[PDB]
């Protein structure tokens, strides 16, 4: 609606018989692949990200934000547990740090 990308803001300018909107938007770039997991089995319980995704570079598992690669160690503060992990399709084993 306000430009291609994630709209940040816009500025109006006049014209002879109309208006010109300068739309400032955020466009992600410099992609990189990772391996994901819907949840994490720890102590026989499934952990899901509070806000973000579980990714692994090659060996380690972090929880990052969706729109920007900012990996962080998985913790009980940035994940929430919901039942055992015999039902989630594609759950992965890992340790959830307890601070």
């Amino acid at each position: 609606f306000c430009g291609k990308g994630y709209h940040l803001m816009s500025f109006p300018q006049s014209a002879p018989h109309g208006v010109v909107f300068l739309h400032v938007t955020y466009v992600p770039a410099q992609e990189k692949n990772f391996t994901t997991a819907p949840a994490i089995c720890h102590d026989g319980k499934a952990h899901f990200p509070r806000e973000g995704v579980f990714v692994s570079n090659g060996t380690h598992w972090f929880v990052t934000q969706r729109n920007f690669y900012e990996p962080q160690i998985i913790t009980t503060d940035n994940t929430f547990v919901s039942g055992n992990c015999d039902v989630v399709i594609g759950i992965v084993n890992n340790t959830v740090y307890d601070p």
Binding site: K4, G5, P28, A29, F48, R66
Partner: protein, 172 residues
């Protein structure tokens, strides 16, 4: 093909040019409408050969390689469900049905392979289960609901697609 009538019309003004200009503008804006609606993305994404979307079945909406204009099953049903001198000419549209089908297939592939990320820039692949978890979180329902009801939700989606198929096939 009447010289007398043509001569009479000459001295009647320039209404013919106005009418032709109006009709030309109408045709141009029709082409613009189709282009604006269907040409949102300028990259023709292709669906992968392995179709593992967490149990969801899009075969009814994805293009069929049987080449019935390379239109999906529902697209063929829709196309078969619509029943279509004196200087009156019908101009062909700029975009053919095949190209429009290509655009729709690209949009479908982008949606099912990368979610909304392909509309804000470069398409970012993501498992369809995780994309649906994103959307469930978007409507205010946590992710665990999906990840625990994945099979049920996939079955319900497939049943809904089948019901749409039946409604378009039989019901008029």
């Amino acid at each position: 093909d009447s010289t007398e009538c043509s001569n009479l019309l000459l001295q009647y003004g320039s209404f013919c040019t106005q009418l032709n200009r109006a009709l030309t503008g109408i045709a141009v804006e029709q082409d613009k409408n189709t282009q604006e609606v269907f040409a949102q993305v300028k990259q023709i994404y292709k669906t992968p050969p392995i179709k593992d979307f967490g149990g969801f079945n899009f075969s009814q909406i994805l293009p069929d390689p049987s080449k019935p204009s390379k239109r999906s099953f529902i697209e063929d049903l829709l196309f078969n469900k619509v029943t279509l001198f004196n200087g009156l000419t019908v101009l062909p549209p700029l975009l053919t049905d095949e190209m429009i089908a290509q655009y729709t297939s690209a949009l479908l592939a982008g949606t099912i392979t990368s979610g909304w990320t392909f509309g804000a820039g470069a398409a970012l692949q993501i498992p369809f289960a995780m994309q649906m978890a994103y959307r469930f979180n978007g409507i205010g329902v946590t992710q665990n609901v999906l990840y625990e009801n994945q099979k049920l939700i996939a079955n319900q989606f497939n049943s809904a697609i089948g019901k749409i198929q039946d409604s378009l096939s039989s019901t008029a």
